[PDB]
Every structure is written in structure tokens, then in C-alpha cells.
Subunit: 175 residues, 4 copies
């Protein structure tokens, strides 16, 4: 396991703010977005198609434990949380990424917003991918990938074990 | 072929306005509704969950042809069009029901709003079912049925060969 | 004070279901609708422009008191409440009509959905208007009238003391 | 007239892409946003409340005329256009900023999206303010200012002669 690095080569700091930006793409960062109409909670996660939109920042925290370091390592379980002062819907749910485990979850389940910090579906690992400062995210339900989503076909995050669907990302420090 | 009858026993007249109401249901009539987020045209068709809502009016017209008669007969191809002065979106498409034949069409294709009068996918038949006063609609892609749709699970219309999904309806003359 | 009558001449029953339908109009009954974008709660009340839409039913209950009668009388304070099994937004607020008394209320304040049963802003009286089975509604902030609202200019309910803005209605028993 | 300068001291070039960002603000750049519900075209312009969102790019072009120079000068009439491949609504109107001159225009009219290049209401000037690198925009209806708008109070652009409402901005060169 190695220090995960941001897009400028510096190791990623626990609790600090990063945009997640899909490598080698015309569109922008990852953002919350409704994936169902009504009810529209929990929200899904999509890549915006808009080129200079950087994403909504997130920060990473270890779970469990790791009373050692202010730095994020690969292959080690974290929670991923959106960081926003404003959050005008879905307020009874958290901002933690989580894999949909509801009774309507799809065979490749959507990644939603609203996990509980300790529940197994909220745990991710960051792993090295082939590509400088390029990574992938995994979960116990599969690797994070995409399919075309409901907003003009923008990529929507799901968990999948189809290798051709993996989402490759880099982490861009919020400055 | 028999004369199709409205919910008061009278023959259904070509060009007059009817609500299409699902038989044996605590919900209301059939209404346009978005089935996709963006783009949201073409519109789909959904049964409203609200009990007192009668649906949006439609009318029926022979296609092709038929100049013998004022009435609508079973087993005979017609167009079905919503009738509404107010139509604030998807103005580039008609108000004619049609089966989705677009490149993204599901295996059980949605019934969408926007057909061309002579197009094959715009032709329906009315057929008798058991009782009442009760009918079904058929197209060359299958019988009109429903699945749970994006508006709190409200039934959404589709063309299907699954007999368990048949939507049984009555036609309520508009005042 | 007199028994208020429905559109079919029968006195109005406490707790029973009625559509409120503006007299002498091309459009339909009164319905909840968002009057602001975000936040969209509390909901406003508009007249739908769609001709055969009857409104969302309401029922009237005395407040205070009146331990006497199953019948609604003029000039006597009631609450007005929307009656719907389904209510998919604004759930932390009631379905009682009320006059907006928030810090952003307009000089002619909107009628909103969400009053508290005993608060003074949730109290209405039904009064006779010139017209058979025609009434108006009043509140301590003024008579219920309309202005053009945000949905294609559909009439939105407000409280006003401008006599030219009064909304004249009839009560149509839900059958 | 002076050469207008971007937030890095370089002269602003006609036709190149800039974000317009409000000076001294915890919110982001300027973006199209619906200001009316239905119809929702034309779009208005709002400052986003989200801190890391840079706004949607614009570019500037002389109108009329001026073929001496590549750069944008103060005190000189230009068009301002949003620049975006993705434009999923209001396609019947341009991406040009304009002052609302429609029959429903407020006393301090909204700045809307959809002007005609030669139309008077589509002409702006850039003027210096105090520091930085800081400017304002003016039109023949007044200076561009803001009021709290329909998206959680986010500032919405309008033309005004109220000096207390002046929006002070910098121009951030798009990468
Ligand atoms: C429900 C709540 C949400 C959506 C519907 C939606 C939804 C979305 C969508 C609109 C976009 C991501 C997809 C995309 O790239 O779109 C690209 C941009 C467009 C397609 C053009 C503008 C779309 C407008 C804003 C929506 C019009 C609503 C239509 C008319 C309603 C149709 C309803 C039918 C059922 C009839 C988006 C984005 C987006 N969202 Mg979103 N998002 C949310 C929720 C949140 C939310 C709580 C947050 C934290 C403040 C949040 C953040 C956020 C950020 C930072 C960003 C982006 O940069 C965005 O990519 C962006 O482009 O915004 C313009 N979102 N969020
Ligand atoms: C886009 C355009 C459309 C929808 C999104 C939509 C959509 C819909 C839906 C709302 C309903 C059918 C489903 C139902 O039973 O719901 C029942 C009632 C509700 C679910 C509660 C009210 C929902 C409100 C009105 C909309 C809120 C939208 C949310 C906040 C957007 C968030 C989106 C996320 C992605 C962020 C409906 C109906 C409905 N429609 Mg619809 N419909 C259209 C389009 C039309 C249209 C052109 C017409 C001809 C005038 C038209 C008519 C029409 C009629 C007559 C009726 C009904 O009686 C309805 O069943 C009804 O209950 O209206 C309240 N519609 N139409
Ligand atoms: C937020 C929640 C709501 C709206 C936005 C909205 C809103 C509304 C509106 C849509 C209509 C009343 C005004 C009217 O006559 O419209 C007439 C019909 C149209 C203009 C065409 C269809 C409009 C579609 C459904 C909405 C598209 C959403 C657009 C694309 C979003 C634009 C967002 C911008 C910011 C970018 C309406 C009606 C309406 N509502 Mg509404 N209503 C609600 C809320 C409720 C609600 C909780 C209930 C109890 C189930 C409820 C009931 C209800 C009933 C029974 C009825 C009607 O009969 C309605 O008049 C009707 O025509 O529905 C189609 N509504 N409700
Ligand atoms: C209709 C079309 C539009 C809106 C409703 C709307 C609307 C808006 C709003 C949402 C924001 C600006 C205000 C803001 O800061 O909000 C900040 C973030 C939020 C308030 C949370 C997310 C709200 C979600 C995305 C929409 C939910 C709609 C509700 C559920 C509808 C209920 C309606 C009731 C009547 C029933 C916004 C932005 C926004 N827009 Mg917008 N915008 C448009 C149109 C466009 C448009 C054509 C473009 C060119 C691609 C476009 C771009 C654009 C960009 C780049 C950005 C931003 O960065 C934004 O500030 C942003 O934060 O996006 C999330 N927009 N655009």
C-alpha cells in the first residue's frame, strides 16, 4: 500500500478537500444528482458533462481506525463524503457515498449518497491504476464504474465487476 | 368487430373526447408524464395515483380511412391523441400515442407521446375483454400493459406480450 | 349564518370531501403547487388551467368547537385541509390552508399549505357571494383572491382586501 | 478607455472564454438559471452559492464594429455570450446576455439569456471600479446589480440604478 497522490503529486491528506475527476475525459468532476424522479432521495452520483465544472469536493476518512497518519493510503477502507455548506434536499440522509443495498437496487447497484459511517456498504478503497496519478475505487460490491445516466447520458456511478466499466480518476486538491 | 361502448353504454364516436380509465383501480385516468429526465421529450403515459383525477382527454380516429361510420369499432386500427389546449413542452412532437421505436427503446417499449398519423407505431386497436364495459388496447408491438414507473411507482404504459401486464380500461365520455 | 351548499344544492358536511372550483371559469379546481423554487415548501395553492381537472379535494372542520352539527355554516371559523393519501413533499408541514405569515410574506400574502389547527392564520370563513351556490372565503388577513401565478400565469391564491381580486367559488362534492 | 484586464493582469481578448466571478464573495461564478417556473425560457443569470464552481464561460465581442484591436477596452459597447457545447433548453433563443425588455419586465429588469446581437438591450460596457482588477458592467437600462433570487436566495442579476446593488466582478481566463 502506498500514499495516494493528488493531481499535483502531493499525498492526499485525510479530511482535506479534493475534487474527483475522471481521467482522460471531456466532461468535469463527480457531483450529486438525482437518479430517480420521485422519490429523488437518495441522490446518485454522476460525472458532469460540463468541461470546466470541477466536481463537488469530497474528503476521505479512515474507517475503521488508523490512529497513525494524516495521509491516505491505497488498499485501506475509508468513507468518502461530499463536502458542502449547502445541502437543500435529502437532509435526513448523510453525505457519505455508499452502494445502494435497498430492495430496488439494480444488479449493478448505483452508488448513492447517504451511507452510515460504519455500515459495510459505505466502505471504499482507493487502488492504483495504470496511469500517472490515476486511481480506481473499489467496494465490497465491485469496482466503481459507470453506465450512461439519466442526465443527457452523463456517466452515472455504479458498482460493477465488469472490468470494461471501471472509472479511472484523479484527485484534484481544492485550492 | 363490435361498436366500442363508453362507460355509460353509448357508442364511442370518432373525434369526441374520452378519459381512458383503468378498470378496478384506486388511482385515476391516464395522463402524460415525463419518463426520462433530460431530455424529457418525448413524454410517456402514466396512470395517475390520485383517485379523483380523470386523466387527460383523448380522441380516436380511424387510420387508415373508414368513411362509413361515426363510431369506433373493435379490432380496427385507430390513432389515439391527447386533446388539450395547454401543451407547454415537447411542442415539436404531436399529441398522438405511439410505441417507442427509437434506438433506446426497451424490450417492452414505452408508449410515448408524439407519433405520426400514418406511421405503423401510431396504430392501436381496441378489443373487448371480460365485462364490463371493459377493453384493452393492442398495437403491432404487443398489448398495452403497465410496469411501475418513475412517479412513486405509478403504472407506466408499455407495449408487451406478457399477458399478466394487460391494462384493462373503460372510456369515460368527457362532459 | 346559513348552511353552506354544494354545487348540487345539498348542505356541506363537516369532514366530508369537496373540490373547490372557481365559479364562471375555463380552468379547473384548486390544487397545491409550488410557488417558490427552492425551498419549494411550503406549497402554494393555484387554480389549475386544465379544464376537466376538478381540484384536489379538501374538507372543512370547525375550529374552535361547535359541538352541535355535521353541517358547515357561513360566517363561522373553520380549518380547510387538503385530503390526499399521497403527499410526497413538504411532509414536516400539515395539509391545512393558512395565510403566509413568514418574514418574507408579500404585502398580499400567499395562501400556503401547512397551517397549525389552532393558529389564527389557519382560520377561514365561508361567506355568501352574489351567485347561486356561489361563495367567497375570508381570513383575518383579507379575502381570498388571486393574482397570476408562476405556472403559465394560473391564478395563485392570496389574501387581499382588494375587492376586484376576490375569488368566487363553489363546492363540488366528491362522488 | 483602458484595456480590460483579467484576474492575472493580462488584457481581455475578444472571443476568448472567461468566467465572470463576483469579487469579495464566498460563492462562485455566474451561471444560467431559471428565474421563472413555466415557461422557464428565457433563462436568467445567477451567481452560484457553491464556492468552487467557477461559473459558465462567456466571451465578449464588440458591437458595433471595431476592427483595430484584439482586446476589450472599457467604456465600449460589447455583447456578452455564454459559451457551452451543452445547451439542453431554450434552444430557440441565443446565449447572449440581454436586459429583459419583454412586457412582463420588472422595474429593475432581469438580465436574461437570449439577446439579438444588434439589439440595444444586448449591449453592455465594462467599466473600472476601485481596485483590483475589479469591474462593473453597465447597460443602457442601468448598472448590472443583484437581488436575492429564487435559488435559496442566490444573487440574481438585474439592471439597476440603485448604486447599492452594483455587482463587482473579475474576469478569470478559462484554461
Ligand atoms: C434533486 C437534487 C439534485 C438534482 C436534480 C441534481 C442534478 C444535477 C444535474 C443537473 C447536473 C449533473 C448532470 C449534468 O451534467 O447536467 C449538466 C447541466 C445541464 C444538463 C443543464 C442544467 C440542468 C438544470 C440545472 C436542471 C434542469 C432541471 C430539469 C428542467 C428538470 C427535468 C425534470 C424532469 C423530470 C421533467 C448537476 C450538477 C451538479 N450538482 Mg446536482 N443535483 C441534485 C442535488 C445536488 C446537491 C444536493 C448538490 C450539493 C449542493 C449538488 C451539486 C451539484 C453540482 C456541483 C453540480 C454540477 O456541476 C452539475 O454537473 C451541473 O452541471 O450543474 C449545472 N447537486 N446536478
Ligand atoms: C415535463 C412534463 C411533464 C411532467 C413532468 C409530468 C408529470 C406528471 C406527474 C407529476 C403526474 C403523474 C404521476 C403522478 O401520479 O404523480 C401524482 C402526484 C404527485 C407525484 C405530486 C405532485 C408532483 C408535482 C406536480 C411535480 C413535482 C416534480 C418534482 C418536485 C420534480 C423533481 C424531479 C427530480 C428529478 C429532481 C402528472 C399528472 C398529470 N399530467 Mg403530466 N407531466 C408532464 C407533462 C404534461 C403535459 C404536457 C400535460 C398536458 C397539459 C400533462 C397533464 C397531466 C395531467 C392532467 C395530470 C395528472 O392528473 C397527473 O397525474 C397529476 O397527478 O398531476 C399532478 N402533463 N404528470
Ligand atoms: C413541489 C410540488 C408540487 C409542484 C411543483 C406542483 C405543481 C403543480 C402544477 C404543475 C400544476 C398546477 C399549475 C397548472 O395548472 O399547471 C398545468 C399543467 C402543466 C403546466 C403541464 C405539466 C406541468 C408538469 C407536471 C410540471 C413540469 C415540471 C417543470 C418542467 C419544472 C420546471 C422547473 C423550473 C424551475 C425549471 C399542478 C397540479 C396539481 N397538483 Mg401540484 N404541485 C406540487 C405539489 C402537489 C402535491 C403535493 C399534491 C398532492 C398530491 C398536488 C396535487 C396536484 C393536483 C391534483 C394537480 C393538478 O390538477 C394540477 O393542476 C395539474 O395540472 O397537474 C398536472 N401537488 N401542480
Ligand atoms: C431550466 C434550466 C436551468 C435551471 C433550472 C438551472 C438552474 C440552476 C441552479 C440549480 C443553479 C444556480 C443556483 C444555485 O446556486 O443552486 C446551487 C445548488 C443547488 C441549489 C442544489 C442542486 C439543485 C439541483 C441541481 C436542481 C434541483 C431542482 C429542484 C429539485 C426543482 C424543484 C423546482 C420546484 C419548482 C418544484 C445552477 C447552476 C448552474 N447552471 Mg443552471 N439552470 C438551467 C440551465 C442551464 C443551462 C442551460 C446551463 C448551460 C449548460 C447551465 C449551467 C449551469 C452551471 C454551470 C451551474 C452551476 O454551477 C450552478 O450554480 C449549480 O450550482 O449547478 C448545480 N444551466 N443552475
Amino acid at each position: 500500500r502506498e500514499q495516494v497522490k493528488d493531481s499535483n503529486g502531493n499525498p492526499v491528506k485525510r479530511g482535506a478537500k479534493y475534487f474527483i475527476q475522471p481521467a482522460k475525459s471531456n466532461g468535469g468532476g463527480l457531483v450529486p444528482a438525482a437518479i430517480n424522479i420521485l422519490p429523488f432521495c437518495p441522490l446518485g452520483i454522476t460525472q458532469t458533462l460540463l468541461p470546466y465544472q470541477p466536481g463537488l469536493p469530497v474528503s476521505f476518512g479512515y474507517e475503521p481506525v488508523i490512529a497513525g497518519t494524516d495521509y491516505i493510503y491505497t488498499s485501506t477502507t475509508i468513507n468518502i463524503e461530499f463536502r458542502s455548506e449547502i445541502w437543500p434536499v435529502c437532509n435526513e440522509l448523510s453525505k457519505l457515498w455508499a452502494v445502494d443495498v435497498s430492495s430496488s437496487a439494480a444488479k449493478e447497484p448505483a452508488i448513492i449518497i447517504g451511507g452510515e459511517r460504519t455500515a459495510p456498504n459505505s466502505l471504499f478503497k482507493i487502488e492504483e491504476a495504470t496511469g500517472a496519478h490515476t486511481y480506481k475505487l473499489t467496494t465490497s460490491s465491485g469496482t466503481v464504474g459507470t453506465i450512461p445516466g439519466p442526465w443527457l447520458g452523463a456517466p452515472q456511478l455504479i458498482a460493477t465487476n465488469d472490468d470494461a466499466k471501471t472509472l479511472f480518476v484523479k484527485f484534484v486538491k481544492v485550492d
